Design a protein around this motif. Structure first.
Motif, short mmCIF file in Angstrom:
data_model
loop_
_atom_site.label_atom_id
_atom_site.label_comp_id
_atom_site.label_asym_id
_atom_site.label_seq_id
_atom_site.Cartn_x
_atom_site.Cartn_y
_atom_site.Cartn_z
N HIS A 151 -0.81 9.18 -28.73
CA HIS A 151 -1.43 9.58 -29.97
C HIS A 151 -2.72 10.31 -29.88
O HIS A 151 -2.93 11.31 -30.56
N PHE A 152 -3.59 9.85 -29.01
CA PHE A 152 -4.89 10.47 -28.88
C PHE A 152 -4.98 11.56 -27.84
O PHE A 152 -4.24 11.57 -26.86
N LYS A 153 -5.94 12.46 -28.09
CA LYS A 153 -6.29 13.56 -27.23
C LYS A 153 -7.82 13.58 -27.33
O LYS A 153 -8.42 14.40 -28.04
N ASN A 179 -12.58 10.65 -23.89
CA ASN A 179 -12.89 9.30 -23.42
C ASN A 179 -11.72 8.31 -23.45
O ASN A 179 -11.89 7.09 -23.30
N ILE A 180 -10.51 8.83 -23.66
CA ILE A 180 -9.34 7.98 -23.64
C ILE A 180 -8.46 8.57 -22.58
O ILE A 180 -8.15 9.77 -22.61
N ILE A 181 -8.09 7.74 -21.61
CA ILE A 181 -7.27 8.21 -20.53
C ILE A 181 -6.07 9.04 -20.98
O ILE A 181 -5.36 8.70 -21.91
N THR A 182 -5.89 10.17 -20.31
CA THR A 182 -4.84 11.12 -20.57
C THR A 182 -3.47 10.75 -19.95
O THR A 182 -3.38 10.45 -18.77
N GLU A 186 -3.48 10.91 -15.60
CA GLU A 186 -4.57 11.53 -14.89
C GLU A 186 -5.17 10.49 -13.94
O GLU A 186 -5.37 9.35 -14.32
N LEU A 187 -5.42 10.89 -12.71
CA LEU A 187 -5.98 9.99 -11.72
C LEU A 187 -7.48 9.94 -11.83
O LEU A 187 -8.15 10.98 -11.88
N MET A 188 -8.02 8.73 -11.86
CA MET A 188 -9.47 8.55 -11.94
C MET A 188 -9.91 7.93 -10.63
O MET A 188 -9.10 7.34 -9.93
N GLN A 189 -11.18 8.07 -10.26
CA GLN A 189 -11.62 7.47 -8.99
C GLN A 189 -11.89 5.97 -8.98
O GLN A 189 -11.85 5.37 -7.93
N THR A 190 -12.20 5.35 -10.10
CA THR A 190 -12.37 3.88 -10.16
C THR A 190 -12.58 3.36 -11.56
O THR A 190 -12.50 4.10 -12.52
N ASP A 191 -12.88 2.08 -11.65
CA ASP A 191 -13.17 1.47 -12.94
C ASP A 191 -14.63 1.01 -12.97
O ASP A 191 -15.30 0.90 -11.94
N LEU A 192 -15.15 0.78 -14.17
CA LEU A 192 -16.53 0.38 -14.28
C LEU A 192 -16.83 -0.94 -13.59
O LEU A 192 -17.92 -1.12 -13.07
N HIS A 193 -15.89 -1.86 -13.59
CA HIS A 193 -16.17 -3.11 -12.92
C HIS A 193 -16.53 -2.84 -11.47
O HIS A 193 -17.50 -3.37 -10.96
N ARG A 194 -15.74 -2.01 -10.79
CA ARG A 194 -16.00 -1.66 -9.40
C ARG A 194 -17.36 -0.97 -9.25
O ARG A 194 -18.10 -1.22 -8.29
N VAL A 221 -11.33 5.13 -21.62
CA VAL A 221 -10.77 3.83 -21.85
C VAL A 221 -9.28 3.82 -21.49
O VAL A 221 -8.60 4.81 -21.65
N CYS A 222 -8.80 2.72 -20.95
CA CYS A 222 -7.38 2.57 -20.63
C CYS A 222 -6.91 1.18 -21.10
O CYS A 222 -7.70 0.40 -21.61
N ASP A 223 -5.63 0.88 -20.92
CA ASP A 223 -5.07 -0.43 -21.28
C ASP A 223 -5.04 -0.67 -22.78
O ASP A 223 -5.81 -1.47 -23.31
#
Ligand SMILES: Nc1ncnc2c1ncn2[C@@H]1O[C@H](COP(=O)(O)OP(=O)(O)O)[C@@H](O)[C@H]1O
Ligand SMILES: [Mg+2]
Lengths: 338, 14
Positions: A65-67, A70-73, A94-102, A153-155
């Protein structure tokens, strides 16, 4: 990459690294050989319990739905070769290098970085709240980051549309009203999570690491103060909850500036506006973008407000009889081939 | 992408 991970996807794909492994989803990076593009592929086995299929369907429709930056593609979804042989869903993104927790656990962020990271998070949340969607599961591990500091954002499986056995969102980020009163989903709960996220960026650790329900509340109130008055105890309507709150030590609002001595005063200000007990008084996402702390990035014209999504977008959640796995399989197939 | 807004060229060595 672990020999135990098996993906029934086109052989044009070649698994690279395992990035996330959970009972619901498994995320691996992979090369699409013919183009040389490296992508992220999330694998889900949704047909063992409606519950899994539901999450999957919700996550899919939201992503398609979104484009928004800040929302994962989502690039696409693997097409099964037959309905009969359709047992896993592979979301290609789209591949990202990591998550904020990391990132929190291995990097010292300047105040600039925090300002920018939380700014993006809030921006994503605004477009969600404006479409009447709430994430319900915002935490650092669901914020993807690139080395240029882009955040997405993901999930979206636990998302819900606002209206008039389940997967549970990590309690360290749950708003006190959700834990107490029978909570009718609200925009305020997500902001509470953002609030926990910002605090974590400043603290470099989670601000409310409760071991259980009780402890969780004891920690939160130990910071924001124990609510005493009835105007204050309004939002909560369930008697036992009123009672439980009253049996708590009476904590004053803890002096944050004394807690975060080296944190930007403006950052703490915004923080205190998010971690408020009464959801009605909690600052909104839009408002938060307007706060002084985010003045370096705020721009009233580059902050999409979104458009309302109706409740029937997730119709499959409001049936008299629950849908069967076969019904759900159809619905997912429909989203994959549309 | 929102890089055009990263007015300070913030990075992270990953
Ligand atoms: N597009 C992506 N690029 C890079 N890593 C990702 C991506 N999507 C997910 N991940 C990694 O996988 C983890 C779990 O993914 P998530 O989508 O939240 O699924 P789950 O339902 O398992 O929590 C994240 O914490 C992140 O490290
Ligand atoms: Mg997750």
């Amino acid at each position: 990459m672990p020999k135990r991970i098996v993906y029934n996807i086109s052989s044009d794909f070649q698994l690279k690294s395992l990035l996330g492994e959970g009972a619901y989803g498994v995320v691996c990076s992979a090369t699409h050989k013919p183009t040389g593009e490296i992508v992220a592929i999330k694998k889900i086995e949704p047909f063992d319990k409606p519950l899994f299929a539901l999450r999957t369907l919700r996550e899919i429709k939201i992503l398609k739905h979104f484009k928004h930056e800040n929302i994962i593609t989502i690039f696409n979804i693997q097409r099964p070769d037959s309905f009969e042989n359709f047992n896993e869903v592979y979301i290609i993104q789209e591949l990202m290098q990591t998550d904020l927790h990391r990132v929190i656990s291995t990097q010292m962020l300047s105040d600039d970085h925090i300002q920018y990271f939380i700014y993006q998070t809030l921006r994503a949340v605004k477009v969600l709240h404006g479409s009447n969607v709430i994430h319900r599961d915002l935490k650092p591990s669901n914020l993807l980051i690139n080395s240029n500091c882009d955040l997405k954002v993901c999930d979206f499986g636990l998302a819900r549309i606002i209206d008039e056995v389940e997967f549970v969102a990590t309690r360290w980020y749950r708003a006190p009203e959700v834990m107490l009163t029978s909570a009718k989903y609200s925009r305020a709960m997500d902001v509470w999570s953002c609030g926990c996220i910002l605090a974590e960026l400043f603290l470099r650790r989670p601000i409310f690491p409760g071991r259980d329900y009780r402890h969780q509340l004891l920690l939160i109130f130990g910071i924001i103060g124990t609510p005493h008055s009835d105007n204050d105890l309004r939002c909560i309507e369930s008697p036992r909850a009123r009672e439980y709150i009253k049996s708590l030590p009476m904590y004053p609002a803890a002096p944050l500036e004394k807690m975060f001595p080296r944190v930007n005063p403006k950052g703490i200000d915004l923080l205190q506006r998010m971690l408020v007990f009464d959801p009605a008084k909690r600052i909104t996402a839009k408002e938060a973008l307007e706060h002084p702390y985010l003045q370096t990035y705020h721009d009233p014209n580059d902050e999409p407000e979104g458009e309302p999504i109706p409740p029937s977008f997730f119709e499959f959640d409001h049936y008299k009889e629950a849908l069967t796995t076969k019904d759900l399989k159809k619905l997912i197939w429909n989203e994959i081939f549309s | 992408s929102l890089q055009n807004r990263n007015t300070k060229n913030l990075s992270l060595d990953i």
